[PDB]
Amino acid sequence: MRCLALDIGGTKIAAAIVKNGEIEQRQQIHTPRENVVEGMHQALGKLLADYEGQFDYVAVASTGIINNGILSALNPKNLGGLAEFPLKASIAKHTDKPIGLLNDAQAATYAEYQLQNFEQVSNFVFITVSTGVGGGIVLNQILQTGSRGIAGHIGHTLADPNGAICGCGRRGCVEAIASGRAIEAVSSATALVERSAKAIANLIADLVISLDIQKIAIGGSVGLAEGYLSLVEKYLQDFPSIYCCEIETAKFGQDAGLIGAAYWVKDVL
Amino acid sequence: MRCLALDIGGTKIAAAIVKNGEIEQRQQIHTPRENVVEGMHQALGKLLADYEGQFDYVAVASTGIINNGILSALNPKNLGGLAEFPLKASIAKHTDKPIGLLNDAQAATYAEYQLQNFEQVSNFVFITVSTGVGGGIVLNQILQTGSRGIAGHIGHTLADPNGAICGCGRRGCVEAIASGRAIEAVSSATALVERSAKAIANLIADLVISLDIQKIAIGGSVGLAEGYLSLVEKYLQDFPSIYCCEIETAKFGQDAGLIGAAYWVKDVL
Ligand SMILES: CC(=O)N[C@H]1[C@@H](O)[C@H](O)[C@@H](CO)O[C@@H]1O
Ligand SMILES: CC(=O)N[C@H]1[C@@H](O)[C@H](O)[C@@H](CO)O[C@@H]1O
Ligand SMILES: [Zn+2]
Ligand SMILES: [Zn+2]
């Protein structure tokens, strides 16, 4: 049908009309860095004005833990210090069409999985390495969300018990070491990108041995970066082969959240 | 019905008759430390002689990755250097009754989960801290095994990228830092047990944020050790509360593999 898709990230908000699977009227605005609550409300109202009368429903792919129309920030530092935002309510102010909501990496995992050889890939993870580090887990071709929408927050699993404190409050999260935010927090060389890639290869090994994942797609601004995937591949062959699996770049690229949310909201009516 | 249960571990083999859910004729013999292939065959044949004519089926809970009647050792050092053993075949030499096979921690996870408030606990993990470190994952009240029987090998996820090399070939596995084998590999103080408990609290945090686990049961010789659980609990409250969940000791104790395998083999006919 006709979908209004939002992809709220810590750095960018995207928006588009997914119609019969195709992205039409793409926009991309900065995510507010200050006055964030006021800013999120103005941005959502603007974006909903722009697409007035062209959608049957609203699908939202949002960074953070999404449960009961509420965005809870595991890492408030991705959302400009914001802890929580009444995401569905704020959107319902502007339309009475249905509104469905999903974590941003869960939505992207749904998108990329649709492109899988469904019978020979039943356990699949998509990893975003962008502003933060996010993930989604499909197991027996079912997307995990959890009772609370937490499933997939693989960026806040342990990369190093002696590493930086993460913005979530935990020490040594993968996101605290590998993410875009973590990379440019130190640069203010090549060796920086390697530390990020090695941490992501450890996370891949972890998900393989823990969940018997058969395939992993990598996305996000850092993940899709020319040369990154090959660096993660190089670190994966230090492991015993049992930890290896095939890694490919996300094929929807930066649109995977839009299409995933659009198709996910539809496909669980 | 009438079940012959085997619980093959890196240090002990147990055996018993599970009948109508109760353990009867328990035995426990050392797991061979040398001449291991010959030893595993003699032990299985002995144990099968002892219980001749008293079982309808054989349920095997085995350390290692269990796929197609074959035990593959992720950490051969737990099985006295053994890499692989034709586990189901060796047992089929002595009976024509059916033989079902499961990882040892997957079986125990099945046991302990049966004691859960099924509606309010749908995502559950059981962690063994014994000879090695093992685990099983229940998600939407379904035990994960994987296409290859790997799901649950949480002992070989990352605890420290600068820690000991694990016997699996990977550096810094949880098992390489927290396990019984890892503890007594250094002692040859209190601070040792703490390092083990802290690593296990990081693993608990990991499984909670990654899979939205609602409850975790701890088992095994180290896990059930007087004072260990409280030490893991103490390390869990250093984390933001989102990573916390309720931890209780395994209630079947050292019989969870026997009953789990017995009931699992039956319950997926
Ligand atoms: C606001 C927030 O805490 N986002 C999480 C996680 O939900 C996101 O998926 C990830 C990437 O978007 O960044 C962060 O790790
Ligand atoms: C032989 C072997 O590699 N066993 C694994 C794992 O399968 C077991 O569950 C764990 C505890 O039994 O030890 C080891 O980590
Ligand atoms: Zn974190
Ligand atoms: Zn290991």
SS3 of B200-228 = HHHHHHHHHHHHCCCEEEEEHHHHCCCCH
Distance CA A34, CA B86 (A): 63
Helix axes A228-236, A190-211, angle to 10 degrees: 60
- B228-236 helix and B190-211 helix, angle to the nearest 10 degrees: 60
Q: Is A8 annotated as a binding residue?
A: yes
- Residue B157, Cβ density class (10 Å: 0-12 exposed, 13-18 middle, ≥19 buried): buried
Instruction: Report how far residue B210's alpha carbon sits from residue A191's, in angstroms, rounded to the nearest whole number.
Output: 28
Query: Residues 180 to 219 of A: which have CB under 8 A from any B CB?
Result: 198-199, 202-203, 205-206, 208-212, 214
Task: Evaluate whether A248 touches A100 at the Cβ level (below 8 Å).
Answer: no
Residues of A in contact with B206 (CB under 8 A): 157-158, 206
Size of chain B in residues: 269
Q: Whose CA is nearest to atom 2 of ligand 1?
A: A64
Q: Tell me the three state secondary structure of residue A232.
A: helix
Q: Which one of B212, B213, B239, B241 makes the best mutation probe of the A interface by having the most chain A beta carbons within 10 Å?
A: B212
Query: What type of residue is A47?
Result: L
CATH number listed for the domain at residues B1-117+250-269: 3.30.420.40
Q: What are phi and psi of A45, to 5 degrees?
A: -70, -45
* CA separation for the pair A230, A51 (Å, rounded): 39
Is residue A78 in contact with ligand 1, taking CB distance under 6 Å?
Answer: yes
Q: B134 contacts in A (CB within 8 Å)? A: none
Determined by: X-ray
Stated as kind and residue range, the H or E segment containing B249 is strand B246-249
Distance CA A153, CA A66 (A): 11
CA distance linking residue B269 with residue B250, whole number of Å:
25
Question: How many Å apart are CA B71 and CA B93, to the nearest integer?
Answer: 16
Helical pair B104-113 and B256-267, crossing angle rounded to 10 deg: 80
Strands ordered across the beta sheet of B70-72: B65-67, B70-72, B84-85
CA distance linking residue A212 with residue A220, whole number of Å = 23
What's the B130 CA to ligand 4 centre distance in angstroms?
Answer: 14
CB burial string A63-91: b at 16+ within 10 A, e below: bbbbbebbbbbbbbbbbbebeebebbebb
Pairing type for strands B133-139 and B124-129 reads antiparallel
Cα A69 to Cα B226: distance, rounded to the nearest angstrom: 44
Asked if A15 reaches chain B (Cβ–Cβ under 8 Å), the answer is: no
Cα(B164) to ligand 4 centroid in Å equals 10
Q: Which residues of B touch A116 (CB under 8 A)?
A: none
Taking the CA of residue A104 as reference, the ligand 1 atom at the shortest distance is: 9
Residue A107 class from Cβ within 10 Å (0-12 exposed, 13-18 middle, 19+ buried)? Answer: buried
User: Do the domains spanning A1-117+250-269 and A118-249 agree at the CATH topology level?
Assistant: yes
A103 pocket-lining for ligand 1 (C-beta < 6 Å) = yes
Beta carbon of B128 within 6 Å of any ligand 2 atom: yes
Q: How far is CA A179 from CA A16, A103, A118, A159, in A?
A: 26, 17, 30, 12
Q: Where are the beta strands (DSSP E) in chain A?
A: 2-8, 12-19, 22-23, 27-30, 57-62, 65-67, 70-72, 84-85, 99-103, 124-129, 133-139, 142-143, 215-219, 246-249
d(CA A67, CA A45): 21
Pocket test for ligand 1, best of A12, A37, A60, A63 (most atoms within 8 A of CB): A63
d(CA A171, CA A156): 9
Q: Which value, to the nearest 10 degrees, does the dihedral of the CA atoms of residues A181, A187, A192, A193 take?
A: 60
A215 neighbors A121 (Cβ within 8 angstroms): yes
Q: Are B137 and B125 in contact (CB under 8 A)?
A: yes
* Contact yes or no for B147 and A123 at CB 8 A: yes
DSSP calls for B5-54: EEEE-SSEEEEEEEETTEE-S-EEEEPPSSSHHHHHHHHHHHHHHHTTTS
| Closest to B11 in 3D by CA, of B50, B58, B49, B63 | B63
Cα A3 to Cα A15, A16, B216, distances in angstroms? 10, 8, 40
CATH of B118-249, one of 3.10.129.10, 3.10.20.30, 3.90.730.10, 3.30.420.40: 3.30.420.40
Domain map (residue ranges) of chain A: 1-117+250-269, 118-249
CA distance B101 to A257: 41
Label the pairing between strands A215-219 and A142-143.
unpaired
What sign does the CA torsion over B227, B228, B229, B234 have?
Answer: positive
Tally of CB atoms within 10 A around A254? 19
Using H for helix, E for strand and C for coil, what is the string for A202-227? Answer: HHHHHHHHHHCCCEEEEEHHHHCCCC
